[PDB]
Design a protein around this ligand. Structure first.
Ligand SMILES: Nc1ncnc2c1ncn2[C@@H]1O[C@H](COP(=O)(O)OP(=O)(O)OP(=O)(O)O)[C@@H](O)[C@H]1O
Lengths: 181, 159, 597, 293, 208, 221
């Protein structure tokens, strides 16, 4: 019986559904994992990719006997092609990794000393995308028709933030359209 | 719904009058009220007393200052307007009006209003003499729970 | 320069402390709500480079415009035309040389001051974007005038046979900025030998104007540039201050944060406010419990009813003291001046009582009259303080009768006759006919003739001079504690930090709790005061059979209903109670029998 | 505390450096106004003339402090030093940084009152250990502003007791009993007292070719005459050839064994003990004869 | 004009929500308005005796007039307009103490409902049979699940295993289970996450 | 029936509830397949830690990952059964009216488990014993049963049945039943044109235009 945050999600558990998706690591060390969703191995060979779930790997970096590899789109030489397909298209945003904003925040707290130059370069190439997305959403909701919108590439964070007002601000106008007759 | 907000919004008024003569007076002697007499009516009885007859007892006298004097004022510029000093609740009073009367004319004119008024309240939500806050009076439930959404979402996103 | 500019668009979009990224995250947050302004906070700027500061702090005007253009371009970028130019607000805290550096090195250098603004002026207009036409060939240009050396930065040129000055100022495509010419006065405590103070002049911009009312301490940062007006001997000029940021103290129009009332709501839940303020108001006053309760209800006030007909009820109180010298009737009054939001201290002589309300004069431009001064036009909401209600024999009585009980003056002089509003609250402390023998004779002769001034006031204390040989030694113990040793600076930091309230928190506090809750007394409590009053007039008329005359009338009875409304503003309850109202008459019944003695 | 504060303020504890030379109150404001007064110091951009404009002015100090080599011989100023930065937010060195930690350990808040006093210092200790990471910033400056007034506060009675002339050279040590001046309450905690002696060992840091013995002070604030008395160490004027440690703790075992009428060693450091008022006067009488150096 | 005091009742009912739900999670429920609800109980008392006079004359006097018919409606319609308010204030009263039936639904000294709102322990102790009922009806629901899943809080998701925790305002020896932690004054802890949830909601360990 | 498959379905069948206007059938069958599992793996790590106690008259990894995992899965069902209680409380007068007279739906085992209908009938009883003796002493003889006859119809239902919810379309691509041009989607409003979904585009809709397509989990929330 919370009665506090019931219609929506707090931002302390939208990260909880994305931490249970796997990425690739660089192992170091040599049964050990009977977690019922485990994929335990034997003596593990280094210099080899393996799709491991993220939350144990964050715990594995606390004891510091492994190293993460960045995903394939995490360089500044790669997001530059994203910022031109949108500047020519005020229609929508094209190509998104769908969980990007909650991914980088975990990947900067305690995952800063891993990749070659994330600091002073990547956060410039992120916060621009945090607003160019939301500049587009301000043009979007002014175009509100009846019971029909078109969102294509929206993050889990922004969909948790447009949510708690856009429901009842059109539900309240659903009365005067329907109950007129 | 145990109606925590709207029965007080149904505690408001209407000026209206009669078609017959009844000795039921609680408003003071001379118990038969003479007909065609203007009487202030609360919402709860008068919503159904204009229903029970064929020809009902009461006469619906429209408070047409809610129908001509402000309908052009809300047509002009919905960025700063009295939604408030004329109705402490504009909304459900507009709802329960349009059920009994069913006029499709002003059914359009608030459908333009609410998206335009909310067009402030989204993009105004990023972070005084006797009555004069009242421009921001009938918006309190509307946006304040959305204000706590943007507040805490920064606080996880930062340290 | 362009190179310099390249060194600011590349700096105010990636400056940050550790992962907060702040200056993009407020510029966006200031383009949604229309303000178009920055707060650079120059001491926080220094993290780039001391050189780029030093190209600023040694040379002016050029730096402000280059910075403004860079910010406008970044603002333009954070969008995709209706785009205005911005304005800057700088602030630092080095130290305030008060009014002493005048010409030596502080010409066109950044400076920080402190003063009290006294005199506002009406608004005006200067232009910032123009469109200019020629007579001969219908040429069309556009010239922007941003920053200043006042006018005559650059003039209209001659280029487009062709006659000179061929150009005109149309009014169809233009923008405008407003100036102020408000006048700064020195804070009157820090130039002490024997001299009168001086004054300067200052102008400003629209998005930081109308932020001051006269009667406040302000701190102010700006430039010391020089204009020259030809309406005195050597070719001289005049000084003035172009100002940048009034990052002053509070206003002393109710917008503020939420944590300011969080502790206030956490304090008001504790029901110990009324007994703790009597200690915590005046930390250097030996007791005086009955008077101390009256000052906190004077500062808060009641309400104002504009009930559905023409008339109204004067919802406020006005206390009055009188008593022997040496019994704190005077030194208490400087104490209420700092704690008030607005307070005026004209406490002497009445000061030519016609000049207390309003004054006119011949004005040098256009040889005209209008209305300029007054001691009551500036004191609305707050409280005035005066003294010596005996030896103002000329016209003090005729100047406060209309000023009180309706607060609606109108000047009948040579120009206007307008009923300007007033919501004032008066306070005074006088002397009887040398104190002692007045209280050892027939108990009249306090004000020598008139009772009509006494019936306009309601609450009257009368102190006296006993000879209690026990508590006085504690008073003689009390004064040597404060006067030297200064242990009350260390005692009222080791009893205050969990229990008492400091002197500056109340100035934060009273302006919030007045301007929010509109209270009303309890409707079933009306049986109490009506049953109370009918014996008080009987207690009155039991005395007049003794050949005794004078003063009690009905105006004090509608003052007690404001007194019980006062503590309801303190507790911020919208309804009153009976534990509420019985303590209020407990204060007044200790000043009902004063008419008997 | 220079890069935090105002090169002005040296105005107080440059007379400490002249207490490190010869003087504290008499002639200093007559003396100091040439060397540390290259201007009557301008307060126009002064917050960045000890931050930024000192690029030219403290480099002039870089060429003053070799022509102030001879000017008074005052060479307890040149030191190699060490510094840290942050990337932004201004530099902070490690000399002033230990000064903030000592002062912040102080403030930041029969015989039954001691429990509510013994539990205070442990609690305000805890709001300093957390101050070593960037997870807190905005209370590190609180110790900075509480640094440069408590030193003004501790001086405000040190100049009083020095002109009281109540330092009595008996035979070997010098006895000073601060009975009651003003502002007595800041001496319950012992960490201010060693600093007070650290200023008081330097007023007697003139030549003093004979009698190089430190002092013993005395103060009281509360009931039953607690009297947290303490001793100091003598100091060399940087010329240890003879590493003098202490002579008092040897004698402290004696008087805690002989009289045995309200003497205590309950406080932790052996250099600080407690004593009763009617026993502190015969305390020294067993000390003036027992020569244990 | 007739049900006027109910509008006054529901207006001060609104302030009970805005005090609690806007500020924080501590309830501090104001008061039950027995003085106020006795007035509407007084007015409904006269109103029910008003109709039984006209319930008596309807066979003897006007003989059930259509004019007299709607006279029963105005006496009817005032009842539910009153009956709407006098339970709406009753529900919003009792639907906020369920917080206390959930945040402190049994962690330590559960049956101690004391040192809490004793001045309004004529309000709530007179409704404690409901409170006790909820209490007992939540105890078996802690055991009606055939496997023991905790229901006493822990609503925030976990983050990791190791959390720096301080302590103050507490003394004595607690935590007889899961290893005794020897809780003494102003002591740092640096422990596993899963043992502190029954003390943070207790409010003995202070800061994360 | 792999345990990874037996968990990802649970997470999908938890998030969908958390913005639902009305109740869904409580899938008790899959819960009992894992109600044994949460007891077993606690018992597995119960004794296997004790063997590590008796080896000390090395490894710290394989204990820590087991301990945090199953309680994290225990956290999900901790919220999942409280929101049932947070929904069944208000809806009580409606669902008994669905359960009093015989109709198309019964409060079945796959609708509600044992303890909450033990909760519901008891709590609705003690609710009725608060309004009765403390308030409804002066209740006249037309206001006995708390349910709406006419006038103000709010003692009946939660007819919020066109509240809008964001939808994610996750149709399994097997063509199979292909109708549309990009993929097989359908819609039908009550009044408007039948413009519809395509593959995975996020939309907003009312509830009974989508209540049919959620019995078959081809489209998520
Ligand atoms: N009740 C009191 N408690 C503490 N101090 C008092 C009190 N009454 C007077 N004093 C002290 O008297 C000192 C000087 O007062 P001052 O000379 O202004 O008195 P005064 O104006 O003659 O008295 P009065 O206002 O009655 O004429 C002040 O420093 C004040 O502390």
């Amino acid at each position: 019986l919370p009665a506090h945050l019931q219609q929506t999600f707090s931002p302390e558990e939208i990260q909880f559904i994305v931490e249970n998706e796997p990425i690739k690591i660089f192992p170091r060390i040599t049964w050990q994992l009977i977690t019922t969703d485990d994929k335990a191995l034997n003596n593990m060979v280094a210099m080899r990719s393996t799709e491991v779930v993220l939350w144990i790997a964050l715990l594995l970096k606390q004891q510091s006997k492994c190293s993460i590899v960045a995903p394939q789109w995490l360089t500044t030489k790669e997001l530059d092609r994203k910022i031109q397909y949108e500047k020519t298209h005020p229609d929508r945003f094209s190509e998104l990794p769908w969980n990007w904003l909650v991914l980088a925040r975990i990947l900067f707290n305690k995952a800063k000393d891993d990749f070659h130059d994330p600091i002073h370069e990547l956060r410039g190439k992120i916060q621009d995308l945090r607003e160019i997305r939301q500049i587009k959403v301000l043009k979007g909701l002014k175009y509100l028709n009846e019971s029909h919108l078109q969102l294509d590439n929206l993050s889990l964070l922004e969909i948790n933030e447009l949510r708690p007002f856009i429901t009842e601000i059109m539900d309240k106008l659903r009365e005067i359209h329907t109950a007129s007759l | 719904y145990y109606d925590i907000d709207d029965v007080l919004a149904d505690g408001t008024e209407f000026p209206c009058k009669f078609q017959y003569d009844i000795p039921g007076l609680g408003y003071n002697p001379g118990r038969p009220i003479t007909k065609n007499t203007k009487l202030s009516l609360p919402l709860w009885l008068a919503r159904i007393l204009a229903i029970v007859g064929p020809v009902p007892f009461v006469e619906l006298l429209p408070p047409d200052m809610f129908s001509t004097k402000v309908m052009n004022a809300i047509k002009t510029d919905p960025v700063a307007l009295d939604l408030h000093s004329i109705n402490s609740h504009f909304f459900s009073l507009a709802i329960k009006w349009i059920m009994l009367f069913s006029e499709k004319e002003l059914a359009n004119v608030v459908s333009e209003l609410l998206l335009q008024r909310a067009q402030e309240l989204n993009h105004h939500a990023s972070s005084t003499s006797t009555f004069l806050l009242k421009l921001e009076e009938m918006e309190k439930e509307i946006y304040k729970k959305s204000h706590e959404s943007y507040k805490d979402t920064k606080r996880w996103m930062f340290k | 320069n362009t190179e310099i500019i390249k060194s600011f668009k590349n700096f105010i979009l990636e400056f940050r402390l550790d992962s907060q990224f702040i200056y993009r995250d407020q510029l966006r947050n200031n383009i949604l709500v229309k303000n178009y302004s920055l707060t650079v906070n120059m001491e926080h700027l220094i993290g780039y480079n001391e050189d780029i500061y030093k190209k600023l702090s040694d040379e002016p005007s050029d730096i402000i415009p280059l910075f403004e253009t860079a910010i406008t371009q970044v603002a333009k970028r954070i969008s995709i035309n209706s785009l205005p130019t911005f304005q800057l607000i700088l602030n630092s805290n080095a130290n305030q040389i008060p009014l002493r550096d005048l010409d030596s090195e502080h010409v066109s250098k950044i400076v920080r001051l402190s003063g009290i603004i006294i005199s506002t002026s009406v608004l005006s207009s200067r232009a910032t974007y123009l469109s200019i036409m020629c007579r001969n060939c219908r040429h069309t240009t556009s010239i922007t005038i941003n920053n200043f050396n006042t006018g005559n930065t650059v003039s209209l040129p001659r280029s487009c046979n062709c006659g000179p000055d061929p150009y005109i100022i149309i009014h169809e495509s233009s923008k405008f900025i407003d100036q102020q010419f408000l006048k700064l006065q020195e804070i009157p405590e820090l130039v002490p030998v024997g001299e009168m103070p001086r004054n300067l002049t200052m102008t400003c911009d629209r998005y930081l104007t109308n932020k001051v009312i006269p009667g406040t301490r302000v701190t102010i940062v700006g430039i010391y540039s020089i204009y020259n007006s030809k309406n005195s001997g050597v070719a001289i000029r005049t000084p003035y201050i172009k100002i940048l940021g009034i990052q002053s103290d509070v206003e002393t129009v109710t917008m503020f944060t939420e944590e300011e009332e969080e502790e206030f709501l956490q304090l008001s839940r504790n029901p110990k406010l009324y007994e703790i303020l009597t200690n915590s108001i005046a930390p250097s006053i030996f007791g005086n419990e009955d008077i101390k309760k009256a000052i906190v209800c004077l500062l808060m006030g009641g309400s104002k009813k504009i009930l559905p007909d023409g008339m109204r009820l004067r919802g406020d109180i006005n206390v009055l003291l009188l008593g022997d010298p040496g019994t704190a009737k005077s030194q208490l009054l400087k104490f209420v001046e700092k704690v008030s939001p607005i307070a005026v201290y004209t406490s002497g002589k009445g000061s030519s009582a016609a000049g207390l309300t309003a004054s006119v004069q011949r004005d040098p431009m256009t040889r005209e009259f209008y209305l300029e001064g007054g001691a009551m036009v500036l004191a609305d909401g707050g409280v005035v303080c005066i003294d010596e209600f005996d030896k103002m024999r000329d016209e003090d009585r005729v100047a406060i009768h209309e000023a009180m009980e309706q607060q609606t003056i109108s000047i009948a002089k040579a120009g206007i006759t307008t009923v300007l509003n007033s919501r004032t609250s008066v306070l005074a402390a006088a002397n009887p006919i040398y104190g002692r023998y007045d209280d050892l004779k027939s108990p009249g002769d306090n004000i020598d003739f008139q009772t009509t001034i006494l019936s306009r006031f309601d609450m009257i204390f009368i102190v006296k001079d006993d000879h209690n040989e026990e508590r006085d030694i504690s008073i003689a113990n009390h004064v040597i504690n404060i006067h030297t040793g200064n242990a009350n600076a260390m005692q009222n930091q080791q009893e205050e930090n969990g229990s008492e309230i400091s002197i500056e928190k109340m100035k934060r506090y009273i302006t919030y709790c007045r301007l929010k809750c509109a209270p009303r007394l309890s409707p079933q409590a009306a049986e109490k005061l009506s049953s109370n009053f009918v014996t008080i007039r009987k207690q009155l008329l039991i005395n007049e059979l003794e050949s005794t005359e004078r003063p009690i009338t009905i105006r004090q009875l509608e003052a007690i209903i404001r007194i019980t409304e006062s503590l309801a503003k303190l507790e911020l309850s919208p309804i009153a109670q009976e534990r509420h109202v019985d303590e209020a008459i407990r204060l007044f019944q200790a000043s009902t029998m004063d008419a008997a003695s | 505390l220079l890069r935090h504060s105002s090169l002005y303020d040296s105005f107080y504890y440059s007379n400490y450096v002249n207490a490190k030379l010869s003087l504290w109150n008499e002639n200093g404001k007559k003396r100091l106004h040439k060397m540390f007064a290259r201007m009557g110091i301008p307060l126009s951009t002064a917050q960045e003339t000890w931050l930024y404009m000192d690029h030219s002015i403290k480099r002039e100090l870089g060429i003053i402090f070799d022509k102030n080599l001879d000017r008074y011989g005052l060479q307890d100023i040149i030191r190699d030093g060490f510094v840290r930065t942050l990337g932004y937010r201004g530099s902070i060195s490690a000399s002033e940084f230990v000064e903030a930690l000592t002062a912040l350990l102080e403030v930041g808040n029969s015989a039954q009152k001691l429990t509510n006093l013994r539990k205070r210092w442990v609690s305000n200790f805890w709001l300093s250990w957390d101050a070593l990471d960037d997870r807190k910033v905005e209370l590190l400056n609180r110790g900075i502003q509480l640094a440069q007034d408590l030193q003004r506060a501790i001086f405000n009675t040190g100049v009083a007791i020095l002109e009281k002339k109540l330092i009595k050279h008996l035979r070997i040590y010098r006895l000073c009993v601060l009975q009651d001046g003003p502002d007595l309450d800041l001496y319950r905690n012992p960490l201010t007292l060693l600093r007070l002696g650290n200023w008081l060992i330097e007023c007697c840091a003139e030549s003093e070719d004979k009698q190089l013995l430190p002092m013993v002070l005395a103060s009281i604030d509360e009931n039953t005459d607690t009297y947290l008395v303490a001793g100091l160490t003598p100091r060399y004027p940087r010329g240890t050839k003879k590493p003098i440690l202490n002579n008092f703790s040897m004698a402290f075992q004696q008087i805690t064994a002989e009289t045995d009428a309200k003497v205590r060693i309950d406080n932790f450091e052996s250099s600080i003990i407690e004593i009763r008022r009617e026993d502190l006067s015969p305390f020294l009488e067993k000390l003036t004869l027992s020569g244990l150096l | 004009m007739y049900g006027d005091l109910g509008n006054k009742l529901v207006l001060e009912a609104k302030r009970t929500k805005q005090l609690y739900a806007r500020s924080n999670q501590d309830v501090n429920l104001p008061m039950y308005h027995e003085d106020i609800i006795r007035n509407i109980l007084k007015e409904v008392s006269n109103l029910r005796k008003n109709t039984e006079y006209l319930k008596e004359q309807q066979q003897l006097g006007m003989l059930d007039d259509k004019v007299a018919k709607c006279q029963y409606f105005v006496t009817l319609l005032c009842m539910e307009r009153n009956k709407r308010c006098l339970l709406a204030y009753q529900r919003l009263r009792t639907d906020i103490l369920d917080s206390m039936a959930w945040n402190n639904n049994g962690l330590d000294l559960m049956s101690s409902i004391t040192f809490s709102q004793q001045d309004t322990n004529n309000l709530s102790h007179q409704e404690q049979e409901y409170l006790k009922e909820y209490c007992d009806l939540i105890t078996d629901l802690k055991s009606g699940d055939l496997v023991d899943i905790d229901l006493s809080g822990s609503l925030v998701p976990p983050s990791d295993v190791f959390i720096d925790v301080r302590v103050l305002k507490d003394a004595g020896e607690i935590q007889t289970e899961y290893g005794v932690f020897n809780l003494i004054k102003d002591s740092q802890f640096f422990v596993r996450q899963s043992d502190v949830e029954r003390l943070i909601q207790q409010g003995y360990l202070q800061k994360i | 029936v792999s345990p990874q498959q037996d968990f990802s379905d649970l997470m999908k069948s938890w998030k969908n509830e958390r913005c639902s206007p009305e109740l869904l059938p409580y899938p008790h069958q899959l819960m009992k397949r894992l109600l044994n599992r949460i007891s077993m793996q606690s018992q597995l790590i119960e004794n296997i830690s004790m063997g590590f106690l008796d080896m000390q008259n090395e490894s710290k990894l394989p204990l820590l990952c087991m301990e945090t995992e199953l309680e994290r899965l225990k956290f999900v069902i901790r919220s999942y059964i409280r929101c049932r209680l947070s929904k069944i409380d208000k809806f009580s007068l409606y669902l008994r009216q669905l359960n009093e007279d015989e109709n198309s739906l019964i409060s079945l085992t796959d609708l509600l488990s044992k303890d909450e209908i033990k909760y519901h009938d008891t709590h609705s009883l003690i609710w009725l014993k608060l309004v009765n003796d403390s308030i409804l002493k002066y209740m006249p003889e037309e206001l006995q049963a708390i349910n709406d006859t006419e006038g103000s119809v709010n003692m009946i239902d939660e007819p919020d049945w066109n509240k809008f919810v964001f939808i994610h379309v996750n149709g399994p691509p097997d063509g199979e039943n292909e109708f549309g041009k990009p993929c097989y989607t359908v819609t039908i409003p009550d009044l408007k044109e039948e413009v519809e979904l395509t593959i995975g585009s996020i939309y907003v809709m009312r509830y009974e235009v989508i209540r049919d397509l959620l019995r078959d989990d081809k489209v998520a929330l």
